[PDB]
Amino acid sequence: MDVNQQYNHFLKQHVDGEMTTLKCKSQMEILNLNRPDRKCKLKNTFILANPDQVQAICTGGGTLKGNNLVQSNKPFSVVICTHTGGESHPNCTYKGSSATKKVIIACDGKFPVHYDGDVDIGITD
């Protein structure tokens, strides 16, 4: 299929089948090192699934809400990394939490996307 670089960016920021609460420090450092001023991102949600399962949200596996937002019809295992302290790397502190939730993402045609990666995917149910 065709490459959508925003889809690759989405997978890098939000899709990791091997993510755990204990891995928040290492995974957030990766995201924070690419942010202007290396400001501590206040939250990031990781989906424990393969790209095909998440891409499907855009092509038969999701409910259209509003403003290009689509809610997955099935729940996903997620890991949420939440800021507890720091303004910038390397003084960022995170708490990891696990949940099972339908995810809310942006779809550009058949491609999950995130614009500016300054926000996060949504969770519900």
PDB file of N, CA, C and O in Angstrom, residues 47-88:
ATOM      1  N   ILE A  47      -1.237   1.873  22.573  1.00  0.00           N
ATOM      2  CA  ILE A  47      -2.174   0.762  22.254  1.00  0.00           C
ATOM      3  C   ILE A  47      -1.360  -0.529  22.106  1.00  0.00           C
ATOM      4  O   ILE A  47      -0.399  -0.546  21.326  1.00  0.00           O
ATOM      5  N   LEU A  48      -1.753  -1.581  22.806  1.00  0.00           N
ATOM      6  CA  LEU A  48      -1.064  -2.896  22.722  1.00  0.00           C
ATOM      7  C   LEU A  48      -1.742  -3.722  21.632  1.00  0.00           C
ATOM      8  O   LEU A  48      -2.571  -4.552  21.968  1.00  0.00           O
ATOM      9  N   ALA A  49      -1.374  -3.488  20.373  1.00  0.00           N
ATOM     10  CA  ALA A  49      -1.989  -4.119  19.197  1.00  0.00           C
ATOM     11  C   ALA A  49      -1.054  -4.005  17.994  1.00  0.00           C
ATOM     12  O   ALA A  49      -0.036  -3.294  18.085  1.00  0.00           O
ATOM     13  N   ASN A  50      -1.379  -4.704  16.915  1.00  0.00           N
ATOM     14  CA  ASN A  50      -0.593  -4.623  15.666  1.00  0.00           C
ATOM     15  C   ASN A  50      -1.195  -3.485  14.846  1.00  0.00           C
ATOM     16  O   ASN A  50      -2.361  -3.136  15.009  1.00  0.00           O
ATOM     17  N   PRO A  51      -0.384  -2.824  14.004  1.00  0.00           N
ATOM     18  CA  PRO A  51      -0.869  -1.762  13.127  1.00  0.00           C
ATOM     19  C   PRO A  51      -2.189  -2.091  12.411  1.00  0.00           C
ATOM     20  O   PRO A  51      -3.058  -1.247  12.390  1.00  0.00           O
ATOM     21  N   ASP A  52      -2.321  -3.309  11.873  1.00  0.00           N
ATOM     22  CA  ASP A  52      -3.533  -3.737  11.122  1.00  0.00           C
ATOM     23  C   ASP A  52      -4.784  -3.579  11.987  1.00  0.00           C
ATOM     24  O   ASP A  52      -5.785  -3.127  11.456  1.00  0.00           O
ATOM     25  N   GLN A  53      -4.704  -3.891  13.274  1.00  0.00           N
ATOM     26  CA  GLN A  53      -5.855  -3.823  14.210  1.00  0.00           C
ATOM     27  C   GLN A  53      -6.241  -2.358  14.403  1.00  0.00           C
ATOM     28  O   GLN A  53      -7.436  -2.058  14.545  1.00  0.00           O
ATOM     29  N   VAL A  54      -5.256  -1.474  14.460  1.00  0.00           N
ATOM     30  CA  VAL A  54      -5.515  -0.027  14.680  1.00  0.00           C
ATOM     31  C   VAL A  54      -5.950   0.603  13.353  1.00  0.00           C
ATOM     32  O   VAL A  54      -6.878   1.433  13.395  1.00  0.00           O
ATOM     33  N   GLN A  55      -5.337   0.228  12.217  1.00  0.00           N
ATOM     34  CA  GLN A  55      -5.710   0.809  10.901  1.00  0.00           C
ATOM     35  C   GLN A  55      -7.183   0.463  10.636  1.00  0.00           C
ATOM     36  O   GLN A  55      -7.912   1.327  10.120  1.00  0.00           O
ATOM     37  N   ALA A  56      -7.616  -0.720  11.062  1.00  0.00           N
ATOM     38  CA  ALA A  56      -8.992  -1.227  10.854  1.00  0.00           C
ATOM     39  C   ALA A  56     -10.024  -0.271  11.477  1.00  0.00           C
ATOM     40  O   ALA A  56     -11.165  -0.272  11.005  1.00  0.00           O
ATOM     41  N   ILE A  57      -9.658   0.497  12.510  1.00  0.00           N
ATOM     42  CA  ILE A  57     -10.588   1.466  13.173  1.00  0.00           C
ATOM     43  C   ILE A  57     -11.130   2.433  12.111  1.00  0.00           C
ATOM     44  O   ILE A  57     -12.297   2.873  12.228  1.00  0.00           O
ATOM     45  N   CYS A  58     -10.305   2.730  11.119  1.00  0.00           N
ATOM     46  CA  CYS A  58     -10.593   3.680  10.022  1.00  0.00           C
ATOM     47  C   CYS A  58     -11.338   2.974   8.875  1.00  0.00           C
ATOM     48  O   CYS A  58     -11.956   3.678   8.089  1.00  0.00           O
ATOM     49  N   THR A  59     -11.329   1.636   8.820  1.00  0.00           N
ATOM     50  CA  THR A  59     -11.910   0.862   7.678  1.00  0.00           C
ATOM     51  C   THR A  59     -12.821  -0.292   8.126  1.00  0.00           C
ATOM     52  O   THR A  59     -12.581  -1.418   7.685  1.00  0.00           O
ATOM     53  N   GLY A  60     -13.831  -0.026   8.957  1.00  0.00           N
ATOM     54  CA  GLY A  60     -14.842  -1.031   9.339  1.00  0.00           C
ATOM     55  C   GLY A  60     -14.855  -1.343  10.818  1.00  0.00           C
ATOM     56  O   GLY A  60     -15.820  -1.992  11.276  1.00  0.00           O
ATOM     57  N   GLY A  61     -13.843  -0.900  11.562  1.00  0.00           N
ATOM     58  CA  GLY A  61     -13.730  -1.249  12.978  1.00  0.00           C
ATOM     59  C   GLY A  61     -14.024  -0.094  13.905  1.00  0.00           C
ATOM     60  O   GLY A  61     -13.761  -0.267  15.099  1.00  0.00           O
ATOM     61  N   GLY A  62     -14.556   1.028  13.397  1.00  0.00           N
ATOM     62  CA  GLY A  62     -14.781   2.220  14.233  1.00  0.00           C
ATOM     63  C   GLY A  62     -16.049   2.975  13.929  1.00  0.00           C
ATOM     64  O   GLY A  62     -16.567   2.874  12.802  1.00  0.00           O
ATOM     65  N   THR A  63     -16.536   3.703  14.932  1.00  0.00           N
ATOM     66  CA  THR A  63     -17.736   4.549  14.854  1.00  0.00           C
ATOM     67  C   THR A  63     -17.299   5.996  14.629  1.00  0.00           C
ATOM     68  O   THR A  63     -16.514   6.535  15.452  1.00  0.00           O
ATOM     69  N   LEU A  64     -17.744   6.593  13.530  1.00  0.00           N
ATOM     70  CA  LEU A  64     -17.495   8.018  13.219  1.00  0.00           C
ATOM     71  C   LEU A  64     -18.183   8.847  14.291  1.00  0.00           C
ATOM     72  O   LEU A  64     -19.379   8.640  14.467  1.00  0.00           O
ATOM     73  N   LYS A  65     -17.452   9.730  14.978  1.00  0.00           N
ATOM     74  CA  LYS A  65     -18.004  10.662  16.001  1.00  0.00           C
ATOM     75  C   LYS A  65     -18.135  12.050  15.370  1.00  0.00           C
ATOM     76  O   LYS A  65     -19.125  12.290  14.681  1.00  0.00           O
ATOM     77  N   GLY A  66     -17.156  12.925  15.590  1.00  0.00           N
ATOM     78  CA  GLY A  66     -17.163  14.297  15.046  1.00  0.00           C
ATOM     79  C   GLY A  66     -15.762  14.846  14.900  1.00  0.00           C
ATOM     80  O   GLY A  66     -14.907  14.514  15.750  1.00  0.00           O
ATOM     81  N   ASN A  67     -15.528  15.634  13.849  1.00  0.00           N
ATOM     82  CA  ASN A  67     -14.242  16.326  13.579  1.00  0.00           C
ATOM     83  C   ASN A  67     -13.168  15.289  13.251  1.00  0.00           C
ATOM     84  O   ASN A  67     -12.044  15.400  13.794  1.00  0.00           O
ATOM     85  N   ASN A  68     -13.517  14.316  12.407  1.00  0.00           N
ATOM     86  CA  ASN A  68     -12.607  13.247  11.908  1.00  0.00           C
ATOM     87  C   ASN A  68     -12.274  12.251  13.015  1.00  0.00           C
ATOM     88  O   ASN A  68     -11.430  11.370  12.753  1.00  0.00           O
ATOM     89  N   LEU A  69     -12.908  12.355  14.187  1.00  0.00           N
ATOM     90  CA  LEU A  69     -12.629  11.427  15.311  1.00  0.00           C
ATOM     91  C   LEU A  69     -13.445  10.151  15.126  1.00  0.00           C
ATOM     92  O   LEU A  69     -14.664  10.227  14.805  1.00  0.00           O
ATOM     93  N   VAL A  70     -12.784   9.011  15.330  1.00  0.00           N
ATOM     94  CA  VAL A  70     -13.385   7.668  15.202  1.00  0.00           C
ATOM     95  C   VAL A  70     -13.094   6.909  16.493  1.00  0.00           C
ATOM     96  O   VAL A  70     -11.934   6.936  16.958  1.00  0.00           O
ATOM     97  N   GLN A  71     -14.122   6.298  17.059  1.00  0.00           N
ATOM     98  CA  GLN A  71     -14.039   5.469  18.277  1.00  0.00           C
ATOM     99  C   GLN A  71     -13.995   4.015  17.833  1.00  0.00           C
ATOM    100  O   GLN A  71     -14.861   3.611  17.040  1.00  0.00           O
ATOM    101  N   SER A  72     -13.010   3.256  18.287  1.00  0.00           N
ATOM    102  CA  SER A  72     -12.902   1.821  17.967  1.00  0.00           C
ATOM    103  C   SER A  72     -14.155   1.095  18.494  1.00  0.00           C
ATOM    104  O   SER A  72     -14.674   1.453  19.586  1.00  0.00           O
ATOM    105  N   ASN A  73     -14.646   0.118  17.737  1.00  0.00           N
ATOM    106  CA  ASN A  73     -15.846  -0.664  18.105  1.00  0.00           C
ATOM    107  C   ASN A  73     -15.443  -1.742  19.106  1.00  0.00           C
ATOM    108  O   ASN A  73     -16.319  -2.236  19.822  1.00  0.00           O
ATOM    109  N   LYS A  74     -14.160  -2.092  19.163  1.00  0.00           N
ATOM    110  CA  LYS A  74     -13.667  -3.072  20.156  1.00  0.00           C
ATOM    111  C   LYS A  74     -12.710  -2.363  21.100  1.00  0.00           C
ATOM    112  O   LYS A  74     -12.042  -1.406  20.719  1.00  0.00           O
ATOM    113  N   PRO A  75     -12.650  -2.796  22.366  1.00  0.00           N
ATOM    114  CA  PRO A  75     -11.701  -2.242  23.318  1.00  0.00           C
ATOM    115  C   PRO A  75     -10.290  -2.786  23.050  1.00  0.00           C
ATOM    116  O   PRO A  75     -10.161  -3.873  22.509  1.00  0.00           O
ATOM    117  N   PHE A  76      -9.280  -2.015  23.437  1.00  0.00           N
ATOM    118  CA  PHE A  76      -7.850  -2.345  23.324  1.00  0.00           C
ATOM    119  C   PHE A  76      -7.214  -2.314  24.717  1.00  0.00           C
ATOM    120  O   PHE A  76      -7.714  -1.580  25.601  1.00  0.00           O
ATOM    121  N   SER A  77      -6.183  -3.130  24.943  1.00  0.00           N
ATOM    122  CA  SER A  77      -5.295  -2.981  26.111  1.00  0.00           C
ATOM    123  C   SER A  77      -4.465  -1.737  25.848  1.00  0.00           C
ATOM    124  O   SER A  77      -3.913  -1.634  24.736  1.00  0.00           O
ATOM    125  N   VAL A  78      -4.406  -0.829  26.809  1.00  0.00           N
ATOM    126  CA  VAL A  78      -3.606   0.412  26.664  1.00  0.00           C
ATOM    127  C   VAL A  78      -2.743   0.581  27.903  1.00  0.00           C
ATOM    128  O   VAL A  78      -3.063   0.017  28.973  1.00  0.00           O
ATOM    129  N   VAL A  79      -1.662   1.315  27.725  1.00  0.00           N
ATOM    130  CA  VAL A  79      -0.772   1.793  28.804  1.00  0.00           C
ATOM    131  C   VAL A  79      -0.783   3.313  28.689  1.00  0.00           C
ATOM    132  O   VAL A  79      -0.522   3.819  27.581  1.00  0.00           O
ATOM    133  N   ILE A  80      -1.089   3.993  29.788  1.00  0.00           N
ATOM    134  CA  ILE A  80      -1.115   5.471  29.889  1.00  0.00           C
ATOM    135  C   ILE A  80       0.066   5.901  30.753  1.00  0.00           C
ATOM    136  O   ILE A  80       0.172   5.432  31.928  1.00  0.00           O
ATOM    137  N   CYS A  81       0.941   6.715  30.177  1.00  0.00           N
ATOM    138  CA  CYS A  81       2.081   7.358  30.870  1.00  0.00           C
ATOM    139  C   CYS A  81       1.668   8.793  31.194  1.00  0.00           C
ATOM    140  O   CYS A  81       1.420   9.592  30.252  1.00  0.00           O
ATOM    141  N   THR A  82       1.556   9.108  32.478  1.00  0.00           N
ATOM    142  CA  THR A  82       1.075  10.418  32.971  1.00  0.00           C
ATOM    143  C   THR A  82       2.194  11.127  33.726  1.00  0.00           C
ATOM    144  O   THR A  82       2.824  10.502  34.611  1.00  0.00           O
ATOM    145  N   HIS A  83       2.442  12.370  33.348  1.00  0.00           N
ATOM    146  CA  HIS A  83       3.417  13.273  34.000  1.00  0.00           C
ATOM    147  C   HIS A  83       3.059  13.451  35.482  1.00  0.00           C
ATOM    148  O   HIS A  83       1.859  13.650  35.795  1.00  0.00           O
ATOM    149  N   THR A  84       4.053  13.399  36.369  1.00  0.00           N
ATOM    150  CA  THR A  84       3.876  13.698  37.816  1.00  0.00           C
ATOM    151  C   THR A  84       4.808  14.854  38.217  1.00  0.00           C
ATOM    152  O   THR A  84       4.510  15.489  39.237  1.00  0.00           O
ATOM    153  N   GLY A  85       5.860  15.133  37.425  1.00  0.00           N
ATOM    154  CA  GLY A  85       6.838  16.206  37.713  1.00  0.00           C
ATOM    155  C   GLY A  85       7.784  16.491  36.562  1.00  0.00           C
ATOM    156  O   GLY A  85       7.960  15.615  35.670  1.00  0.00           O
ATOM    157  N   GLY A  86       8.360  17.694  36.572  1.00  0.00           N
ATOM    158  CA  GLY A  86       9.326  18.182  35.578  1.00  0.00           C
ATOM    159  C   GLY A  86       8.692  19.059  34.513  1.00  0.00           C
ATOM    160  O   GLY A  86       7.497  18.856  34.186  1.00  0.00           O
ATOM    161  N   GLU A  87       9.479  20.004  33.990  1.00  0.00           N
ATOM    162  CA  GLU A  87       9.103  20.895  32.872  1.00  0.00           C
ATOM    163  C   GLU A  87       9.767  20.374  31.593  1.00  0.00           C
ATOM    164  O   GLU A  87       9.120  20.407  30.538  1.00  0.00           O
ATOM    165  N   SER A  88      11.013  19.899  31.674  1.00  0.00           N
ATOM    166  CA  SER A  88      11.772  19.440  30.487  1.00  0.00           C
ATOM    167  C   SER A  88      12.669  18.253  30.822  1.00  0.00           C
ATOM    168  O   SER A  88      12.988  18.053  32.008  1.00  0.00           O
TER     169      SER A  88
END
